[PDB]
Amino acid sequence: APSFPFSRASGPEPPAEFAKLRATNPVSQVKLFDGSLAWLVTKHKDVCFVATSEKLSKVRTRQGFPELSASGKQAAKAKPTFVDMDPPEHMHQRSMVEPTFTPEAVKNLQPYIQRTVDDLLEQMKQKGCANGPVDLVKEFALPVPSYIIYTLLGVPFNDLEYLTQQNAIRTNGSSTAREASAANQELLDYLAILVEQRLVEPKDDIISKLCTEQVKPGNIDKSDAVQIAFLLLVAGNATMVNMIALGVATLAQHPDQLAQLKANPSLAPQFVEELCRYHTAVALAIKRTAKEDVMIGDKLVRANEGIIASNQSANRDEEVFENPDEFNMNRKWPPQDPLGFGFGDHRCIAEHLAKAELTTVFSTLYQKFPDLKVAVPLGKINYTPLNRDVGIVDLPVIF
Ligand code: HEM
């Protein structure tokens, strides 16, 4: 049994092991950091099964849960939020914050998302690049998702820049454990204050709705509200940043596709669809423990055994997506759902918001800067370490 998680084959590539497993051993055992074994599922159909089976659990206090690191094992000791819950607890808490993320709500949020993107791009243009390239991540990919989620949560305008930087520090690869932790605890402290304030004078934001609708009636306590708000912030921000950066890098790698997008920004939705399939930046979230014996393919997963269903591998499943390793924004989509946002009950709560942010970015970025170019050879892109989910640390650009 090989050690898992695997390392990416290269900066922009997924681990090389998956393709081989899908072809000769779709459901197999892998060895985790603590020496325990877990079942690795690599085929689309099997990943979908794992994501929806009622015989599988997300509760991390169950022995056998596939924690992939020492930190994950310690983090599993805290009171859980809906991300680590099973029915009926799961939807009971998730439904407390779903309103802002529904397809209808996101459609109505479009003008705000567009203004946020327009403002950040204008700021970038005014700063210019007359003295050399600027970091697309720091100047654009980071603030876009950050400002939006912070604003939706309830953070006032003047606090956005500092809070955006602090949240970045908690996941920055250059941060020391001490710094990441400090930033983490600081964001929690700040959210605690916001909850106290919104409890007194509610405004029109997520935190206020949690206070008025859940805390006051006694459905949850203040700390619960803080943790729910915290989850909404840290769950997908870093991923959004990385997806925007990867999108720009990808377009640079395939000139004709960029030419097509520039000539027709209406193709942004399909470009985003392909991006979320090709670059599965959240590939280690579909994990479970078997509550009872369950058969998957030619294997029997016994009660209390862990399972990791790779949506990354599923998105490269040749049986579902023709020429899976080819990035094609004009891809002819099959009836099967690509799995960039998961599947089943737990499917990303912000899938629609995320897609809206990405679509707004890629339908506007090259209209603003038609000559935007990465200022370093593409082969020198600074990607996240290979033993981590795919992403980009910084991206020098000129325009
Ligand atoms: C393009 C960026 C994003 C990608 C690719 C992404 C992908 C995912 C994936 C794969 C999961 C696992 C779903 C499953 O268990 O089947 C997930 C869960 C989740 N994501 Fe995201 N996500 C993104 C953006 C966001 C944003 C913007 C937020 C916050 C506003 C967010 C909040 C969450 C939460 C709260 C969960 C847990 C849902 C649950 O367990 O019920 N995500 N996301």
- What is the Cα–Cα distance from 226 to 187, expressed in whole angstroms? 10
* 211 known ligand binder: no
List, in sequence order, every beta strand (DSSP E) within the chain.
27-31, 37-41, 56-57, 134-135, 287-290, 294-296, 299-301, 306-309, 373-374, 382-383, 392-394, 396-398
Q: How far is the CA of 253 from the centre of ligand 1 (A)?
A: 27
Amino acid letter at 3? S
Q: How far is the CA of 232 from the centre of ligand 1 (A)?
A: 9
190-216 as b/e: b if 16+ CB within 10 A: bbbebbeebbeebeebbbbbbbeebbe
Number of Cβ within 10 Å of residue 264's Cβ equals 10
- Among protein residues, the one with the nearest Cα to ligand 1's atom 28 is 236
Ligand 1 atom closest to the CA of 281, numbered from 1 = 5
- Among protein residues, the one with the nearest Cα to ligand 1's atom 4 is 341
Summarize the chain as % helix, strand, coil (round to 5).
Answer: 50, 10, 40
Closest CA to 275 of 254, 297, 252, 246: 246
Which CATH superfamily includes the segment(s) 1-399? Cytochrome P450 (1.10.630.10)
Task: Mention every residue, 6+ apart, whose C-beta is less than 8 A from residue 305.
Answer: 37, 38, 39, 64, 289, 290
Q: How far is the CA of 352 from the centre of ligand 1 (A)?
A: 10
Tell me how far CA of residue 25 lies from CA of 30, 39, 69, 289, in angstroms.
12, 11, 25, 20
- Among protein residues, the one with the nearest Cα to ligand 1's atom 26 is 236
- The domain ranges of the chain are 1-399
- Between CA 5 and CA 142, with CA 326 as vertex, the angle to 5 degrees is 60
Which of 246, 341, 346 gets mutated to test ligand 1 (max ligand atoms within 8 A of its CB)?
A: 341
- Among protein residues, the one with the nearest Cα to ligand 1's atom 18 is 348
Q: How far is the CA of 128 from the centre of ligand 1 (A)?
A: 34
- What is the Cα–Cα distance from 234 to 183, expressed in whole angstroms? 12
Resolution (A): 1.7
Q: How far is the CA of 258 from the centre of ligand 1 (A)?
A: 27
Structure-token pair, residue 186: 């600081």
Contact in structure between 131 and 223 (CB atoms under 8 Å): no
Ligand 1 atom closest to the CA of 285, numbered from 1 = 12
Ligand 1 atom closest to the CA of 149, numbered from 1 = 30
What are the φ/ψ torsions at residue 222 (nearest 5 degrees)? Answer: -55, -50
The radius of gyration of the chain from alpha carbons, rounded to an integer in Å, stands at: 21
Closest CA to 395 of 192, 190, 252, 202: 252
- What is the Cα–Cα distance from 23 to 318, expressed in whole angstroms? 10
Q: How far is the CA of 346 from the centre of ligand 1 (A)?
A: 8
- Between CA 155 and CA 109, with CA 151 as vertex, the angle to 5 degrees is 160
Q: What is the DSSP string of 129-159?
A: -TTS-EEHIIIIITHHHHHHHHHHHT--GGG
Residues with CB under 6 Å of ligand 1 are: 51, 82-83, 94, 149, 231-232, 235-236, 239-240, 243, 276, 281-282, 285-286, 311, 340-344, 346-350, 353-354
Please give, one letter per residue, the 3-state secondary structure of 352-394.
HHHHHHHHHHHCCHHHHCCCCEECCCHHHCEECCCCCCCCEEE
Q: How far is the CA of 354 from the centre of ligand 1 (A)?
A: 9
Number of Cβ within 10 Å of residue 219's Cβ equals 14
Which of 164, 228, 275, 348 gets mutated to test ligand 1 (max ligand atoms within 8 A of its CB)?
A: 348
